[PDB]
Amino acid sequence: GSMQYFAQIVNREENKWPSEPINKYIHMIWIGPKNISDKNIRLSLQTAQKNPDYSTTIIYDSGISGYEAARNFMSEKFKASKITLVDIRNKGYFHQLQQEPSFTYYEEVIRNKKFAQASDILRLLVLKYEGGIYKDIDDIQIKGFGSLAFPKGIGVMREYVPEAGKSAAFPNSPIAATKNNPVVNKTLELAVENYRHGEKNVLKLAGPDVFTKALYQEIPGMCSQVLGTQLEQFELAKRQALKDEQLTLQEKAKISRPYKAIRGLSEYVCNGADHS
Ligand SMILES: O=c1ccn([C@@H]2O[C@H](COP(=O)(O)OP(=O)(O)O)[C@@H](O)[C@H]2O)c(=O)[nH]1
Ligand SMILES: [Mn+2]
Ligand code: NA
Ligand code: NA
């Protein structure tokens, strides 16, 4: 055994996944016939104003009854801002997006006027085809994102146990992603299965619990328990090197680095889940 070798494989682990740059697009969704709220207009203007280096868009859908009046209302409220409104059906890639099995279910869900539920599918499809940052219309921009880059090209906020929930879930807003990101693709694959199975449980469709399952499948160490087992494997390697044998704070920080970095949207957006 060699402590020189050990220090080197700890250094290697820290740097295993180079940070991948995120496209400077902020995607938000306001689909359906309802007038966007005064609060969500203010939060949207604030999102765009804090991010002058980003193109901020609100996506609507001309395939939904009553879309025109809702689109017109938004056009008037955002006329002074750099926010642009875009029809999902106008996207250059819509011909391919329309053929996605998940888009079949998006169409079924918007027909039943479940727009929040439909947004869980649509946010993933937009990230798949464009990359950038998806944010809920009702999420608070704390400060500008600036130039972001994430290990495995995926950025999320910290997990927590949601209201009346059992297990910790990563929120599915905001999400930063490289185009065609494996985590986004896995979430869509799990969602298509849940919908094909005729799932009625709203926690088992395309929401935070499904996003969390996708993140754990693609990046196992995102689970605090699995990272624990990885740290224990390095502790064993340190014992082998020295055969004082416990991992230092610095060693644990190095081994955990990319998993902490993936939670890097935590400081930029507040979803109000932590409000009194
Ligand atoms: O009529 C509606 C209702 C919701 N949404 C979108 O769906 C997102 C998710 O819904 P919501 O924020 O209500 O979900 P939660 O914050 O409870 O997860 C919203 O932020 C909007 O971006 C929409 O486009 N039209
Ligand atoms: Mn929300
Ligand atoms: Na499932
Ligand atoms: Na190891």
Numbering used by the authors: 15 to 257, 268 to 300
What do the authors of the reporting publication say about this deposited model?
The respective glycosyltransferases are important virulence factors such as the Clostridioides difficile toxins A and B. Here, we describe two glycosyltransferases of Yersinia species that have a high sequence identity: YeGT from the zoonotic pathogen Yersinia enterocolitica and YkGT from the murine pathogen Yersinia kristensenii. We show that both modify Rho family proteins by attachment of GlcNAc at tyrosine residues (Tyr-34 in RhoA). sYeGT has a cone-shaped structure comprised of a globular domain with a Rossmann-like fold on top of a three-helix bundle. The catalytically active domain is the Rossmann-like fold domain, which features a 6-stranded antiparallel β-sheet flanked by 7 α-helices.
Interestingly, in the absence of ligands, sYeGT crystals belonging to space group P43212 appeared rapidly and diffracted X-rays up to 2.3-Å resolution while in the presence of UDP-GlcNAc, P21 crystals were visible only after 8 weeks but diffracted better, with a resolution up to 1.12 Å. The asymmetric unit of the ligand bound sYeGT crystal comprises two molecules. Each protomer includes the complete N-terminal part of the construct but lacks 14 residues at the C-terminal end. Although sYeGT was crystallized in the presence of the substrate UDP-GlcNAc and Mn+2, only the UDP moiety was visible in the electron density map suggesting that the sugar nucleotide had been hydrolyzed during the crystallization process. The uracil moiety is mainly stabilized by residues from the WIG-motif (residues 44–46). In detail, Trp-44 forms a stacking interaction with the purine base, and backbone atoms of Ile-45 and Lys-48 form hydrogen bonds with the polar side of the base. The ribose moiety is stabilized by hydrogen bonds to main chain atoms from residues Ile-43 and Ile-151 and to the gamma-oxygen from Ser-133. The manganese ion is coordinated on one side by the pyrophosphate moiety of UDP and on the other side by the carboxylic groups of Asp-150 and Asp-152, the residues of the DxD motif. Notably, a third aspartate residue, Asp-153, is indirectly involved in the manganese coordination via a water molecule. Another notable feature is the loop flanking the nucleotide binding site (loop F, residues 171–188), which is bent toward the nucleotide when the latter is present.
